Amino acid sequence: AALRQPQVAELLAEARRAFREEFGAEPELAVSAPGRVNLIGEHTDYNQGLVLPMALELMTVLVGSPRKDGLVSLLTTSEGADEPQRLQFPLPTAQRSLEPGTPRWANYVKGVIQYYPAAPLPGFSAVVVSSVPLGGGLSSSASLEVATYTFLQQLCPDSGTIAARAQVCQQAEHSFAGMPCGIMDQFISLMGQKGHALLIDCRSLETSLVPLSDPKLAVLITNSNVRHSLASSEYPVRRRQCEEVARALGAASLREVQLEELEAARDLVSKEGFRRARHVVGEIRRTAQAAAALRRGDYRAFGRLMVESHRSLRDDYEVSCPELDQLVEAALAVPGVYGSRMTGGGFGGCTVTLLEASAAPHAMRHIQEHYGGTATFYLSQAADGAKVLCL
Template identity: 35%
Template sequence: MNTTLTKKVQESFITTFSTKPLMIFSPGRINIIGEHTDYNDGFVFPAAVDKGIIAAIQKSDTNISTAFAIDMNESVSFELDKLKPSSEGSWENYVLGVVAEIQNRNRVVGNFNIAFSGDIPSGSGMSSSAALENSVVYGLNELFNLGLSKTEMILISQKAEHNYVGVNCGIMDQYASMFGIENNALLLDCRTVEAKPFEINFKEHELMLINTNVKHSLSDSAYNDRRSACENIASLLGIKALRDATEADLLTIKDQVTPENYQKALYVIQENNRALKASKAMTDGDLETLGALIYGSHEGLSKQYKVSCDELDFLVEQAKLNKHILGARMMGGGFGGCTINLISKDAVDAFKLTVSKAYKEKFNKDCSIYSVKLSNGTHVIK
């Protein structure tokens, strides 16, 4: 966690609101494998990271509440009994949505002030939105003694995203951000919303993220399209979600769906199996198998699910040329954001140089590279 950032947020809050706040850290997340499986009731393998949102929050003695986005230098004031979504794409919807969903659970929130900032790289697919939602619900739960469990809190965050932000997200991002455990990844069953922690020991390897620094505009509409394609195929099969299907089941309806949607459903079934195999590979300390599964995941995301883009594919191809990288894939919703790479520690510096240069030559723009550590989930900063 970033202590300089913590200090900045705290000072900014005190300057703006003239009181001492409660400080919350809510992490972003990576996902080792299991992409687009969460809304199919499947398995995912996320971990909270040491980058995230830091929020300062305190009760207000006025009759309005105020949220201040420090990085954008924008603030929004609102009345708790008149909440409604702002225009699409507004950051305040993450805050307003959480408050509205808490109220929907018949909990009483008083007026409050919140200021926040983050160090999750923008557009990186590390889920700054879930981190922000979780920081708001966690802070309000502490301030007003709402008695919400962590599970209730993440469901509130998810509903806020559905109803106020308009993205029909699964539960993975909120779960990983709230329940993260230092040095562990969580094999999360998105149907039962229960996870098994796996202590991560990558031995001589580490995780490196490469941000394409692009975000192609397809993302939200394509996400909702794919989600509905998966749901349609599940209903054709007479099952609750694709998590319950096998490749053999899918073959039985092949002539009833478009070839594109067949491939999308096939990808989800195969990716679910990869996530389960990855947990076994990690238990066995078999990093070669884990790496091969990660490459397989990218292949499926790019060719079958079609949520990759030239920049992501290029970075994965560059990784394949390097024998010190065991696996690489795009991470997150797609059409931009980051690749995640399992790379030998002593090869990091050299690869950074070669891949940055190659990317710049190919796309005439820079990629950004970061290493991440696995962190604890949302908590009060003491």
């Protein structure tokens, strides 16, 4: 009774009803974009490294219709959203551009509109709904950026590439939400495919769809239901730190630096700096092994490289928190768990447990009985990325 089911048919239905009530007519378009769990490859994306996320059945839906008057009218229904629930604004122009501000959920939609590369973009009316827990570490902000972007393509098709769309979504996260994120979360929300993880190369931007078929394997996501102060504050600090271990070692990114190099480079950088790399330069060179291991269906090893990812996130990158540590170390003692680790940016949010489906009922008994805080669970199929339904 801690498991939240996806309920995606009723999420779309909720959004259409709220649209008819709010705007006096039936919406003409539905889009969705998923949130994400990163299986392995944490704090690598901005280090031009490798990540292995998948898309969730947890998503953000826009339902809307173009307007003739050049203005945008938004209703959000998400419980967590900061007041007001509605905002309206003219389209940006050469003269006036959109500005971040109040309410914050709107900043994401504004950013994407502001950086949208095709024209002419008409005004629109839209309802925004999401089953992605807001600020819970499964990329609610990326689902809303990419859901926005997918709605704008229907209003005014772009003639570009999946990376250009991810950079636009990423720029809205930088400029309008003041969060200097990598490309992972936008990329997986765009490109996820049911029954697949997505191995992303954040240097080359090559991507591989890795079958996650086997119905033996389950991915249990557990929300800690915490977010520490340190989150919003330490993420850019870590990023900046990485950029100095890279600058010091005459490497254009840590992708280029290998562990044998960092170990014999100790003197050129700081104890906590060098330790940030043992994680990053290390991390890269085990998502690769996790990738090569999921293909072999090996599981143990992804696991080892996984718990090795948490331990490294906890001790070297210092971006876990006692709640995440107690959840990982808790699951990691249940036989049949290959691995568990913090996922996403850390300082709170979710862990990800690679278990055997048979044991799912007992784990959710156990974790809720053996976790100090409030556990929410998702038993997540690997899902589709951005989608359109004409209405």
